[PDB]
Design a protein around this nucleic acid. Structure first.
Length: 339
RNA sequence: AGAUGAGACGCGUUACAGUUAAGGCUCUGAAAAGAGCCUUAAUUGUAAAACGCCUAUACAGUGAAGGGAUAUACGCUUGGGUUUGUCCAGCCUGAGCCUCUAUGCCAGAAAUGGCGCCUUCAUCGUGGGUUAGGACA
């Protein structure tokens, strides 16, 4: 399964793009004349980390009659999109706000309007171009959404009625005004319910125009090295910080902080707990815990068990858990081991 | 009835540094208390998140000029980097080309124009691509 590979790819490329734009903003603000120790630079640079989300303002707008229409998978995916939008907007700002703090900071530093527009360009510049439209190349190009009229021609051609009302049905379905007329003939002649969902799927132009033939005949130890999340390794004790929700009920004794361990124990005692499985977020939130500003549940340092210094490698500041362990040490990771 | 692919916004982890709150230790002081160190949590700032391989004939920015459907490329053909002991997928890209495919944004009923986009020159720098997926050894 390559879905986790795609997720890691996206995180990697997003971090690289953020590196590129921070480097360009750093270079341009140095080229203006004020490098450091001037409060315009710290303000604008700290704004640049959290630049905002104007590109997808109100993403995937949809009406409730459409929410009642699609399949279970698509409506669960749309609920995921709605939850993603709600979760980001509590921590994301729209970019026109971030532009406003950039303007405030740069006006406070008596800069020119051309410099403000140039910083605006650096903030809005797209580095890796959105190249998405023609990506999947499932081909029968060797003969052995842009196909709308051909597709309804394939659907309607099996109806017993004569060709002229087939053309009128085609003209009714390609035009968005005449949908009630399609319901009129669709009540008039009783076909399968698969025919309604299919025909009104071309009427709503989902991704079905690419799964198609050529137009003339429409008629372990392999790749991964180590764990994703860095661990903390200081003076011989190995720990990693966990959120309270993420701590499983069977692992409460592993928390290094004693007082929060007792509070988690009486949290499991006060509320109904499931023995040894992961505990819920809002279920944990009602008990006595300090709240965070942004994500709204605290974090507690936890001890990692079962592994030790025999696998730990150090790439820059981070310390990871090696997945392959001994290959005799692995030659690719042989230079980064701790001992 | 299901799967490959692009671009960000965010969250989370780690390192360093600062601040606040709570706790512990030491010194000083007649005492109130003052100072310093350590632990936990919250908050802020900067940085890292494959190892590596390839690329300076490259990559990126700015300005000017020209083109922009008689056109470009996420396309085709043929090569290359990732690439190894060998072969792929995916991504990125050189040359030719418009045969298939794809062709964004804004104003305008439209014609059309302006942005995005492509090429050249000058200037400024060092930057860019791919790496968590497989199969045979």
């Amino acid at each position: 399964i390559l879905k986790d590979r795609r997720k890691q790819r996206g995180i990697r490329r997003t971090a690289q793009t953020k590196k590129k734009r921070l480097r360009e903003l750093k270079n341009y603000l140095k080229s203006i004349g004020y490098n450091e120790s001037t409060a315009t630079f710290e303000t604008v640079y700290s704004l640049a980390h959290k630049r905002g989300y104007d590109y997808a303002d109100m993403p995937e707008e949809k009406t409730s009659e459409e929410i009642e229409a699609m399949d279970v998978e698509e409506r669960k995916q749309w609920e995921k999109e709605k939850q993603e939008w709600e979760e980001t907007k509590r921590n994301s700002r729209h970019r026109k706000e971030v532009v406003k703090d950039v303007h405030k900071a740069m006006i406070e530093g008596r800069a020119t309007e051309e410099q403000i527009k140039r910083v605006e360009r650096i903030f809005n510049k797209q580095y890796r171009p959105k190249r998405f439209n023609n990506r999947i190349l499932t081909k029968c190009k060797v003969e052995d959404k842009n196909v709308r009229d051909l597709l309804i021609e394939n659907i309607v051609r099996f109806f017993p009625i004569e060709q002229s009302e087939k053309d009128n049905l085609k003209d009714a379905v390609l035009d968005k005004n005449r949908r009630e007329e399609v319901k009129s003939f669709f009540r008039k002649h009783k076909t399968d319910e698969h025919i309604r969902k299919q025909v009104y799927d071309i009427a709503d132009n989902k991704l079905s125009g690419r799964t198609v033939f050529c137009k003339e005949h429409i008629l372990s130890r392999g790749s991964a090295l180590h764990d994703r999340n860095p661990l903390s390794y200081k003076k011989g004790i190995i720990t990693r910080r966990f959120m309270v929700t993420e701590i499983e009920c069977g692992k409460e004794d592993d928390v290094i902080s004693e007082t929060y361990r007792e509070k988690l124990k009486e949290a499991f005692k006060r509320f109904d707990t499931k023995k040894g499985k992961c505990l819920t977020d809002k279920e944990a939130k009602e008990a006595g815990f300090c709240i965070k500003k942004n994500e709204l549940v605290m974090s507690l340092k936890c001890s990692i068990k079962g592994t030790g210094p025999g696998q730990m490698i150090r790439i820059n500041n981070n310390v990871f858990k090696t997945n392959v362990h001994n290959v005799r040490k692995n030659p690719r990771l042989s230079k980064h081991f701790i001992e």
